C-alpha cells in the first residue's frame with residue numbers, strides 16, 4: 001500500500017519540547033495546534049511521546065489525547081511510560097488510535113496481547129530500539145540505557161507472534177545524527193515480519209526517506225527535521241512521488 005510520513009512530537013506538561021519554527025502558528029509550542037497544522041499540510045499520522053513527571057503524567061497525557069482527538073481527523077499514536085493495560089486502555093478510550101510501548105513490552109510481552117485482545121492488533125505499536133553490539137543487532141530498553149541481550153531478530157518475531165500491529169524500528173546508532181535512516185537495519189528486519197515497519201532515527205534530508213522506503217519501510221517517522229523546517233512535508237511528498245514512491249497527496 002501507500003508509504004506514510006509520520007510526524008513525532010516530544011511533549012512535556014502539554015508543551016512541544018523545543019517547539020517549532022512555524023511562525024504562522026499562534027503558539028508554535030502548542031502540540032495541538034502544531035499537530036493540527038501538520039494534518040492540514042499532508043502528514044499521514046501523528047505520534048506523541050510524553051516525558052511529563054510522574055505525579056502529573058497520567059492526567060497530562062489524558063488531557064493531551066482528548067484535545068488532540070477533537071482537532072485532528074488523521075490517526076495518532078501516544079506513548080511514553082505506558083507500562084500496563086489500564087494506562088493503555090484509558091488513553092485509547094479518551095481518544096488515541098494507537099499506543100506505543102517499548103520497555104514494558106520487553107519486560108512483559110503478554111502486555112502486547114492484553115492490549116490487542118480488547119483494542120485489536122492495529123491499536124498496538126511496539127517501538128524497538130536497536131543497536132549494533134559486537135556485530136549483532138541487540139534490543140535496548142530504558143531510553144537506550146540497558147542492553148537486554150535479546151537479539152533484534154528474535155524480538156521482532158516474538159512481537160508479531162504476541163499480536164502487535166506495527167513496529168517502529170529505532171536505530172540508536174542514528175538517533176539525533178541527521179546522517180540517514182539505518183537502511184541496513186531496516187533491510188535486516190524486513191524479511192522477519194509481515195507487520196508494517198516504521199523507520200525512526202537519522203532523518204536529515206528528503207533523499208533519506210526514499211532510501212528508507214527502498215529498504216522496505218512502510219512509514220518513516222521524523223521529529224526536529226520537520227519542526228525546525230529543514231524538510232517541508234509538501235516538498236517531501238512531491239519528491240517521493242516524483243521518484244516512484246506511492247505516497248498520498250492529501
Ligand SMILES: N#Cc1cc([N+](=O)[O-])ccc1O
Pocket residue numbers: 008009010047048049079100102127129143223
Ligand atoms: N514515537 C516515538 C518515540 C519513541 C521513543 N522511544 O520509545 O524511546 C523515543 C522518541 C520518540 O519520538
